[PDB]
Design a protein around this ligand. Structure first.
Ligand SMILES: [Ca+2]
Lengths: 378, 82
């Protein structure tokens, strides 16, 4: 049941739970004609109680999205709620006003206001239970099972020349319930990035990933008493969450906690790429599996990390498979990478044939002068 | 004086050029002896009845925002150099 709301027409699809994710992703791609994503990051925090500090806003939005505007990605931001969601949404629109970054809003149809009017073709939605935003341009209206299964589907489908799609999760000061949402997520093999100064459950998590005895019989009670003390908790409820934490902390490779206020020198893209490579290390050591992440590095122009982490000597590279990324580095004229690829084992002797050279010459930017010269001569 | 002119009077030359440009822009096509027709025609039209032109709200607003972004980039660059 696809429809559009002409507010600025925004599309929406009503989907019940346990629906085949493949059908959803394919309907998205075809009927909305959205570009293939080179990255997807899923938000996990929305608490309107605590405002966003400076050190958070500046980097998290400006420094991250200004860089991501070069390669584009998807943002699985929760809609129909009040929080940083509308901030990020309008931020993307203001950045585009000046490869694209888009936000997809998914939310349960019950918590929305004026849902009968939408269920019964732009359904007028002027709103003074919580009302819905009119900034986000797309809606997947129903839910945690859907988000988990859709992440499992995206992290698996191969859109490549056969390359994967990287997935990442960004936890920003969430409520205790999200614990469950994260628990099974560790089984789903998707790297988590936890902001240590966020100020929700991210705080207690950042604290309790490293301990002498990671088992938290009552120190978890101590932390939950320390942070957000307005909410009292039953010991019988705790005795379960502590086991949840004891299970989650049993996979250190996936999750990574990071602090931004102490030394913000490392921008967001650096830690994102670092966590992605750290997670992809544990899975396998094949040549092809590293390609997607590697491509992302080329888009960020981060030679030092690609040299330290990828080309450390673990993955044995051959001259056969570096051709695609080599052409991608040539066309984008990043020369610090071409030298690295040549030294890593690639050869210009067998790679460059007259067909490849014609393909390179076809790729001249249409605005440039050589383009017009060759076109006029032809 | 030359050296003074190498800087300041060279700037004046440009200043003089700008003044001349505006002066000739305001002149009509007819020559000194032919002005007797253009001035008369202009006076007749006035008795009977460029730089100044500006855009609309939408169009202009984009320009203003773009300039703002440029200024921000400039300041951030100055800070980085600092
Ligand atoms: Ca990969």
């Amino acid at each position: 049941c696809k429809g559009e709301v002409n507010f600025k027409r925004s599309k929406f699809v009503k989907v019940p739970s346990n629906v085949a994710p493949s059908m959803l992703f394919e309907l998205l791609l075809t009927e909305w004609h959205l570009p293939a994503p080179n990255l997807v990051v899923s938000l996990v925090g929305e608490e309107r109680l605590f405002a966003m500090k400076s050190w958070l806003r500046d980097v998290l939005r400006k420094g991250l999205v200004k860089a991501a505007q070069s390669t584009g990605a998807w943002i699985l931001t929760s809609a129909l709620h009040v929080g940083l969601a509308r901030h990020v949404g309008q931020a993307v629109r203001d950045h585009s006003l000046a490869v694209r970054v888009v936000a997809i809003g998914m939310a349960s149809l019950d918590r929305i206001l004026h849902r009968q009017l939408l269920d019964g073709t732009p359904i007028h939605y002027p709103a003074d239970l919580c009302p819905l935003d009119s900034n986000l341009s797309h809606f997947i209206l129903v839910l945690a099972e859907l988000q988990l299964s859709l992440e499992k589907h995206i992290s698996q489908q191969r859109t490549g020349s056969s390359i994967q799609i990287p997935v990442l999760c960004l936890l920003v000061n969430g409520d205790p319930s999200t614990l469950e949402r994260m628990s099974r997520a560790v089984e789903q093999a998707a790297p988590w990035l936890i902001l240590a100064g966020s100020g929700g459950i991210a705080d207690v998590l950042a604290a309790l990933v490293g301990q002498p005895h990671l088992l938290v019989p009552q120190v978890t009670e101590k932390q939950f008493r320390e942070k957000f003390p307005s909410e009292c908790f039953s010991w019988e409820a705790i005795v379960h969450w502590t086991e949840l934490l004891q299970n989650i902390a049993a996979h250190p490779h996936l999750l990574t906690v990071y602090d931004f206020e102490q030394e913000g020198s490392e921008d967001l893209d650096t830690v994102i790429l670092k966590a992605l490579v750290k997670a992809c290390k544990s899975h396998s050591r094949d040549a092809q599996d590293y390609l997607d992440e590697l491509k992302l590095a080329v888009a960020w122009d981060r030679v030092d990390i690609a040299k330290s982490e990828i080309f450390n000597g673990d993955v044995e590279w051959k001259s056969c498979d570096l051709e695609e990324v080599m052409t991608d580095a040539l066309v984008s004229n990043k020369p610090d990478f071409v030298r690295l690829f040549v030294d890593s084992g690639a050869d210009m002797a067998e790679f460059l044939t007259y067909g490849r050279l014609q393909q390179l010459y076809h790729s001249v930017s249409p605005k440039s002068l050589l383009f017009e010269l060759l076109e006029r001569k032809h | 004086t030359f050296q003074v002119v190498q800087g300041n009077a060279d700037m004046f030359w440009k200043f003089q050029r700008y003044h001349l440009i505006v002066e000739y822009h305001g002149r009509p096509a007819l020559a000194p002896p032919f002005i007797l027709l253009s001035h008369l025609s202009l006076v007749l039209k006035q008795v009977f009845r460029h730089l100044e032109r500006d855009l609309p709200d939408p169009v202009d607003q984009k320009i203003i925002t773009w300039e703002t972004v440029q200024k921000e980039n400039f300041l951030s660059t100055m800070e980085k150099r600092r």
